[PDB]
Structure formats: structure tokens, C-alpha cells
Amino acid sequence: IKKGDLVKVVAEKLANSLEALASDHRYPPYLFEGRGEVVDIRGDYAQIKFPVPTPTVWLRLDQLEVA
Amino acid sequence: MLLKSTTRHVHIYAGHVVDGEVHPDTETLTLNVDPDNELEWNEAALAKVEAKFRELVANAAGEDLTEYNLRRIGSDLEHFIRSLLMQGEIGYNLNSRVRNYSLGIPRVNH
Amino acid sequence: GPVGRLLQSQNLSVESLGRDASGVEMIKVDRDRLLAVCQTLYADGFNYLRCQAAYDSGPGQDLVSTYHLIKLSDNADRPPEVRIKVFVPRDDPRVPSVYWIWKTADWQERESYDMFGIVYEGHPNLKRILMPEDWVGWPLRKDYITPDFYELQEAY
Amino acid sequence: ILPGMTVKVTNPNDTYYQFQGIVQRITDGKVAVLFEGGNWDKLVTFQASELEPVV
Amino acid sequence: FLNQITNYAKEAVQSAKYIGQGLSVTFDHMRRRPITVQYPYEKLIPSERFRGRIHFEFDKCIACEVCVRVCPINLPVVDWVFNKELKKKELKHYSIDFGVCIFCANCVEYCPTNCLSVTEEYELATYDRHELNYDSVAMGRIPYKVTQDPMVTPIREFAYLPAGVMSGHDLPAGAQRAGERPEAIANTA
Amino acid sequence: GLLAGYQFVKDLESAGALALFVPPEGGFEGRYQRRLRSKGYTTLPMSAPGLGDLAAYLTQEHGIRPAHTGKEDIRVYFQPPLVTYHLENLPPNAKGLVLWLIDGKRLSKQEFAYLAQLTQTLPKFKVVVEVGGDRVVRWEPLADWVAA
Amino acid sequence: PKIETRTEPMVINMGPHHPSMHGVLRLMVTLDGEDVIDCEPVIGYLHRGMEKIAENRTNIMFIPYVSRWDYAAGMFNEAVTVNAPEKLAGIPVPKRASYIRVIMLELNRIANHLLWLGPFLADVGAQTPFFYIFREREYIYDLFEAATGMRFINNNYFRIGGVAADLTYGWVTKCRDFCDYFLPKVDEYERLITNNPIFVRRLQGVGKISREEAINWGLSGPMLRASGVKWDLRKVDHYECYDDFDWDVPVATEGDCLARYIVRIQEMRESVKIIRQALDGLPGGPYENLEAKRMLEGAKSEWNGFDYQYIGKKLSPTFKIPKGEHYVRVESGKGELGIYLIGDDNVFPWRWKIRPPDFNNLQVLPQLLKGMKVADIVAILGSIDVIMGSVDR
Amino acid sequence: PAILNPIARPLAENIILTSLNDVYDWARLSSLWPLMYGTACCFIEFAAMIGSRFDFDRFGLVPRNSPRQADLIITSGTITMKMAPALVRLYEQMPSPKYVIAMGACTITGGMFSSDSYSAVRGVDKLIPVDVYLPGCPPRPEAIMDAIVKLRKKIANEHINERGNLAQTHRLFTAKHKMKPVPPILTGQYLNAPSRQAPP
């Protein structure tokens, strides 16, 4: 995983975590399988950009999958 | 409280039409598909839309009656309508007073 | 500076910080001494509560809530101000209300609860004013997933 | 005239009086004149008898 | 008790005098001419600072992708390809949507080779929004001049009047830009 | 008022392209546009400033680039010719088509001769261009406006 | 129809349309006759999420958004968002640029004070200040369209180093003509209220805001001066050389609608005096004298230097801000505007906390609407001078 | 199929009926009663036309606050999704010969709030059928008068024999759900609250 690579978000760790508390118990279909951009990696988190008109989010390193 | 969410094509009313009006009732959800003359319809694709609406209202179980879940159901219904339009099915009609492509423009595959 | 010695004069142990560029200085209280610090600060001055901000130190870090206090005079040159920092974790966002001392943040705590999701104990009316009341989730977090709607997608 | 030379408008009726511009293109007897005022580049068209060439 | 009656009578005659003064200023307001303009018969004169449509040239372009980062929405797209015969890139297509445009003229300022231009067009009314992706050969057209149209009447705004005019409708002289242009000051003084 | 008869239809069927002078204060070409539908013509509103090139939009297919915000990649949409696809699934009675341009002031005289030749090449659609007009409703041949 | 008149209190739901001059606000009024007991305000129909916009955005891409924050003046938010990075990085500003900045800020404050007494006098009586106030504001519209290009907020005009553009040739002369003409128009508006019928007696005791309650509720702006507190923020902190001219803060004794009217009426004349002294300043005169002294004299002898320039230093489009937080305060037309900005050595900032001036003053509206009549509701709502784009944001 | 989103394919008149149709269209062209709906600075730009500088009244348009005696609605401003059913009900409570003019860049499309936004509605054409669009942020009042002129050019295209289009079909469907009952929302109860005077 580097700056500007294809990313895929899995839904196996987002059941009981700190990122699942702010989420409203459901997930959109574009977050399961699709295309996503990696903006930058500051520390342990990474910025994920989606093709929908939606502001960028922040996920962990052990929550993604390369494709 | 009359819970409803409509944009241009789907109308999910949380009541029951007796003759021409509605009453507040949390037991019946009435669906109206395409009230304005924007898309021409048939009996098979409308039945598929009704079956998808029944599947979506059977999926949402054990939740509170709020505007967010009903708007999400209406958004999934309009996404199903848009994917049915993109599948190679019925589209616009040249008989209205205004012609505005709100879902998409006719394009070429190849 | 002087506000740290004023807090230490009445036997209060706080964490002292410095100045960012010029002017303001920060005093960090975590969960318990906030009411005592506000009670011994209201007697000297600071009768005009300025504002209350809330942010994150990181995507997996804790909530930081900064109150801005400033003393009031009739006609002064430069009255000194101060900031009070509350470092509360996101597992239990419990910050006590200061509505009974100052009535300025009666809606600021409501706005912070709508934006980030901080539960304020002792609030008369803590509901949704910016977001709809049927809308769930905090939109101003570092990890906020937006549900797909017909009006929220791109315009074709 | 040629596109790429400096001209000057000399019409006393218009608001732009003696303004140096840059000719962009010529079609239908109309000349596109690009003015340079401040930090924005405006383009106001004129006629072929309105402008005068200035070296 | 009588002093309250005299105060009420004084307030009543003062209210009657105020009603008479309001009638007097209302009758005074009928003497002045209307200061409105007709459309599309008396169109206003656009100033040199008033912006409009974005004009694009296909000749003085290098496809450097600089003004895209200046735009907050990144509306001008650059369809550039890589050629192996030359050593630079060439522009193929240029499209820009105008329904989401802010019209602030920020991409025109950050341009060294002045590839974008300001065009005095504001009359944009279309029954559909899908045609707003304007082509470069559509943006390369000639703007509509308000002077050359013989059916409209040119009339300047408030700040384009000689020596100070409060109405600005007759304009019997041909003077404009109240002040002095900085060319004769170097000749006389 | 003025009780207008059926004279614009004969002038449109005789020539191939017409130019009518309307007052820009309101709307008066709607009466002729309704009389054309009463005679059996299908109207098509279109704006003359935003068209790109006439050949690549009326005869061949074009490629539209939608304005992306950096979220999506660079995509191209294949647009067919407008009057050809409007002429494909057209006819209830198979009489004729018209093309109406609203603001014909922001155009050049180079493509007008090409449009007047294109409306004479295929005898199934007409070309109606609107000019800002001078105080009266009058019709003129577009080829005479090109030649003079 | 089923209208059953009972002996229960009637809940009046004022819709969020408000089709006179107001925005979106759902007011639920609970009463039992010809008074007002309870009032519930509901907002949320104009919130656009500005704080999520500045999460990934630079300084050159945030100018139309920060100008579309408040749609009354707009240039105060631009002035604080060009003051926060120049104080975070330590970039100086020329004196003539700050003179142009304070001239444009006071000229927008004039129009912001002009757009308060229109609907406030329209909802209480005769509807004939409307056309004349709109003509007097259209004069400012034409002046700003001749100066910069637009009539209001859609105007960038500000960078980190300074102003990118300059004034035109006749703008100072038309501004002097506007200061010549604006004074009898405000003397007429003060003579409309200094000798009047029951308009003075109608809004005379409806607010009654005390001093300590206004301090505890956190009131900032003209209401704090109407209560009798001299807390003008331009006198506490000198913003851009504010200690060079003569100043006078209008202070009212009691806090009501008439006092809040006459404070802004006097503040119009104070702003006219400030822009007149600013025209009396301007060390170098208009653009004609500056261009003549530049083209007549030498290249770098006496005139062309550092103080008298366009910007002074061309800033980079993608520049890095230093790590740290910053807070500035500026007295606006509604109240005090503040920006709490946090940078962490990156192009996009981390936290953009916005301090709205009307959202803190809207808390007095549940206290103000208590025990009053039905016709005083719109006057009370118009007297605070709140904006839905500032309380929703 | 090779064609995405296809379009489905869909005479002697009298002179007196034509003149009656011209009179019926001229009456709607002459009256043209609008509705003033605005939530932002576009409402101020509309109110600048009502003043005695541009004279928007002279075409026949009079300001009315009633969404029942107006054959034309003018939506204007940034539209929040909480205001979208309000706009839908305000459009539906109008009479049947209604027209829509959308003024503004954030009204006809997403505008500036199309990059990073979760509350602004990206386009009013998803809510109400727009007849005449109007780009601009903010547009000139002369451009609003030009949109009025184009709307007047579009009204005269209507017919008196093809008047059978201003209606809505039934297409009713009845189904059941299994949702839980919700507690009610707050109506008032701000000042005389038991948690306000008594500190917990």
C-alpha cells in the first residue's frame, strides 16, 4: 500500500471497533466492492477517497485489501 | 405525524388512501410509481418494481419508523429504477410539456 | 502564567501549557476539577464565556474540547484571556455542562453534541438542531460513512 | 491587420477611450480585442474601423 | 385630569400635522421622473471589471494542468495524450460545465500565457442542463456587443458619469470616466 | 389584434431555411410554432449558442466529457447526432420535422451556409433561426441573408 | 371540517417559509389567547456543512465558500481568513493595502446596516422606505460592480500578501459623491423617528434587556452597546491601524428596538466619518497621482518601495502553514467573528472551527418572546438582525 | 441492444378555435403571477428587481406570498434535504397550470456544494420539473428577465386540443411492513421544562 494505489475495503473487522461506533450500523454497496483512491498515509490511518460526491474518510491499515 | 419522502418518481406514504385523502396509520405503506408524465411504463417492469419494493420492505424489519429508513428505501427504489432504465428497458416519452433528462442521456454502447 | 498561580493558590493541580503565537494560554483539566476551576475562576472574573470548540487530535485519538474564557471591563486596553482544555476519550464522551455558570454555551454544547457526539451531563435540551432528529450518526467525525441517497449522488 | 499586434480604440462614444489591446482573431469584419487591466484579462470585440494600429 | 385631555389633543394635532407632512412629501415624490430602465430596450453598459463567460483558445495552450488545481471544483478538464514523435503533450478535447460554475474568475488570474479570457456574456437561459459542457470551438466565438445592436439603447451606470450625476439617464455630453486619464498629466505636468 | 392565417407554413415548405424577426420583449413565434404542430410538424427546441460544431453534432457522433471533481476518472460519453435520432423514431404521419434555434445572435456566418446546404441535402427536416428583430414580425430567406 | 374549540392552549406552528424577508426557521408558538407563553425554534433547513468543506481545501480554493458563509457582507470572513495564515506564518501587510481593506470593510458595513431597517420598518408600518433603501443599496451595487466586478459576496479581492487588484480611476470621486449624498438620507431617516406617532410608543418596552443578563447570555454586537457596555472589538484590539482617526461609540441607556435602531442610525454617520477620514488619509493619493509619480520620476528613487505596492510578495498557490492553532476576533456588522484554525504542517488544515455571531445571539430569542403580543413576534425577530445562513451554516 | 436509455416513439383546425387559443395563451402571457420563495442571497437578488431600479412589475408579475394564486414558482438558494419535502408540498399545493424557474448555480445543479457535501441537494430537477434553467452564481437580474422572456416564449407553445397532459395517474400499490412504533418528536416544551429551572 503506497501513495496513489487501488484499495478495497473489507467488512470483517468493522463489526466491533472504534470505527463502527460512528457508523450507523449499515454499509453502502460501493464500500463493499468497487474502486477507491489512497490520498496519503500519515500514521496508522489512511485517507480513502470514493468516486461518489462524498468527503474523504479515514481507515486503518489492517482493514483494507490491495487489488 | 405524516411520514413521507418523495423526490420525483416514488411516493412512499405512511397511511392509506380511502377515497382521495390519507389518514395517519403506521400499519400500511402506499407506493406510487412515476406520478408525473416523465417515463412511459408497462405491466411487467412495474411488477418487477413492485417485487423489488416488497423485497426491500421485507428486508427492513425490526427497525423504528423514521424518515431516514423510509428515505433509504425510496433511494434504493430509485436506484432500482435507474438500473432498470440502464438495463435496456423503457425510458422517456415524447408526449410531455417539458423534457428534462434527470436520470441520464441516451448514449452509445460501442 | 498568572492564571496558573491563581489556580495553584487554592490547591489545584493542573497541567500548564504555553502560547501558540501570542496571547492565549491553555490549562488542561480532564474530568473532575473542571467545576472547581470554573467556580474559582468565576469569582475573580471571566464573566463572559466566549466560545467552545471540539476537535480530534487524530483519527484514533481522543476528543479535545476547548473553552475560551475572557474577563470583561468597561474600557481597558488588552484584557487577558485563557483557554480550558478537556481531553475526553471517545469511548465515553462525558463532559459536564457549564450552563448554570454561563448561559452562552446553551446551544454550543448542543451543536458540539450534534457534530461530534459529546454527551453533556446536566443539559436541559440536548437534541438535534443542525442535523435532522431522525438522522443518526455524527457527520463531523474522522470516520463518517455517508449513506447513498437520490439527492446525495452526482448530478447526471 | 494581423493577429498579434497592438491596436488602440479611439471612439469617443464608447467607455474604453485610448486603450491598448491585443488582437486575437479576425472573422466577419469583427476584431477581438483583449484588454489587460489589473489581474484579469477581458476580451471586448470591436469593428475594423474603430481601431487604429499603434507600433 | 384636564392636562391629559390637552396632551391628547396636542398628540392628535401633531399626528394630523404628520399626516399632512406625509401627504406633502408624497405629492413631492410625484414630481421626479422615474429612474428605471427598460429591458431589452435600455441595456446597461458592462464595466471592465464585471466578469462573465470563460473564453478558451486552442492555439495558445500547452496543457500544463495548472488552473485545474486552482479551481475548487476542478471544472476544466484536460484530455491530454502522450505522443512518441514529439517530446511534449497535446490537448485533444476541452470541456467545462457552467451549471456548477461559481463565476469568480480565479483560474484566469493564475495563467502566465493568458489562455483563458473574460467574455461579457450573462444572457444564458436554456431549457435543459445537459448542454452546458461547452466545447472549445463553442467558447471561441465572438461576444455580443451592446453597442452594435441598433435596437437597444446604451445607458451607463452610476459610476460612469462625468463630474457627478445623480440620475444618469439623459447624458447630453460625450464625456466619461470622471477624473483624468494618466497620459495628459505627463504632457502638461 | 392581428388574425394571422396560414402563410408561414407555405414559406417553410417552399424554401429550406427561414429567418423570422421577432420582438425580444415577449413571445410571438409561439403562435407559428403551434401552427406548425397543428399542420403536422414535430417541434424541437434547441439553443444556438451552445452547440459546439454543427457537423460533428448533427451528422456524426461526438464525445462529451463530464465535469469530474477528482473523485471519478476521465470518462467520455458517446453522443449520437440529435436530428438523426430524432428522425429515427419520429413519424406518426410522416410529414416533416423542424429545428428551432432560440438565440441566433451569437453565431457566425460561416456555418449558416453549411446549415442551409444540410437542410437541402436531406429533405426531411427544416431549419428555423431567430434574429433579435426590428419592431415587426417579418420572414426572410436564410440563403438571401447569407448571400447579402 | 373538524374545528373543536376547547379550553386547551393553542400551539401555533409558524412554518419555515417566512415570505417577507426571512429565511428558514420553524417557530412553534404555544399560547392561550392574545399573548405568548412558549416559543420553540427549529433550524436545519440551511445547514450546508462548511466545516467538512475545509477538511481538504487550500486557501485559494476556500474563498467562494468563505464568502458564501454569510450572504450580507461576506468580506469579513475573507478578511479573517486572510489574517489567520498571515499571522500563523508571520507575513507582513502594507499600510495602503490595509487602508483599502478597512475602506471596503466599512463600505460593506454601510450596506449591512442598510439591510436591517427595511423589513424592520416594513413589518411594523408603512411600506415606503423599501424602494428608496433598495435604490441607495443599488448605488453601492453599481459602485462595487465598477470597482471590483460584482455587487456582493461573489468577490475574492483578498490574498495572503494583500489585494491582487487596485481601485479604478473615478471610484474615489464617486465615493466622495456618495459621502456627499448619504448624509442627508440618514438625517431624513433619523427625522422620520425623532418626531413620530405611536411607533415610538409601540416598540418602547418590549425587549428590556438588562446588563448582567446580557453578559451571562453572551450578547455581542449592537445589543451589547444598546445594553450599555462599551465592548467594541475594534477598540480592544487594533485590527488594521485603527488608532489613527477619531472614534465615537454610540451607547444607549436602555435596551429596546428603538435604541437598537438609533445606535445603528448613529453608526452609519460614524462609518461615514471613518471613511471620510480614510479619504483624508491615503498616503500617496489616488491611482492617477501614483501612476504619474511612477512614470515621471525614477525607477526606485522615492516612490516605488515596499509600503506602496500592489501585493508586495507573490505567494505560492500550494504553500504550507506552520503547525499550531490560532484565533482572531473582528467586530462585524452583526457581532464578533472568530476563526479557530489548527494547522499541522500540511496543505489542508485539520480543524476549522467557525464562531458564528448570530447563533449566540439567537439564544435570547426564547427569552425575548415571552408575554408579548402576536404582532410583536416579527418585530422581535427582525430587531436582533439574525441570518439563517449564519445560524445554520 | 447497443443503445442505452432508449426513447419510445409516440389534421385540420379552425380559425376561430385558433384565435381563441391565441387569446387563452395571451392571457397567461400577460398575467404570469409568480411566487416568491427564497432562502439565501438569491432572494435578495430577486427583491432587488421588485425595487424601482429594474421594474420587474412592468411585465405583469406581482409579488404574492400565497402558493395558491401563482401559476409560476421561482425556487432560489441552497436547498437542504430537510427543505425538499417542504418544496414538494409547496409545488403540489399550487394549481395545475404551474411553471418552474430555477435561479442559481446551487439550484439547477450541485453548485459549489457538489465536491464535499452531505446535506445540500444536488439539483432541483430531481424534485420539481424545471422548464427554464438559469446558470449563474449569482446571476444578473437582466439574466432573470431573459429567463422570464424565454419562459414567455415557452408558454405560447401549448395547445388547446393537447391540454390532456396536466394530470397525475394513480398506479396505486398496497403493501405491509414490520416497523416499530417511534416516540413522538418535541413540540414546544422549551421554557417551562422540568430540567431547566430545577438543576439535576
Ligand SMILES: CCCCCCCCCCCCCCCC(=O)OC[C@H](COP(=O)(O)OC[C@@H](O)CO)OC(=O)CCCCCCCCCCCCCCC
Ligand atoms: C378637501 C377634503 C380633504 C379631506 C381629507 C381628510 C381625510 C383624512 C382622514 C384620515 C384617514 C386616516 C386616519 C388615520 C389616523 C391615524 O392613524 O392616527 C390617529 C391618531 C391615533 O393616535 P394614538 O394611537 O396616539 O391615539 C390613541 C392613543 O392615544 C391611545 O391612548 O390620532 C387620532 O386619533 C387623531 C385623528 C386625527 C386624524 C386627522 C385626520 C384628518 C387629517 C387631515 C386634515 C385635512 C384638513 C384638510 C384641509 C384642506
Ligand code: SF4
Ligand atoms: S488554459 Fe492555461 S492553465 Fe489551463 S491548460 Fe491551458 S495553458 Fe494551462
Ligand code: SF4
Ligand atoms: S471561474 Fe472559478 S468555478 Fe468557474 S471555472 Fe474558473 S476557477 Fe472554476
Ligand code: SF4
Ligand atoms: S448560486 Fe451563489 S448566490 Fe445563489 S444561493 Fe448559491 S451561493 Fe448564493
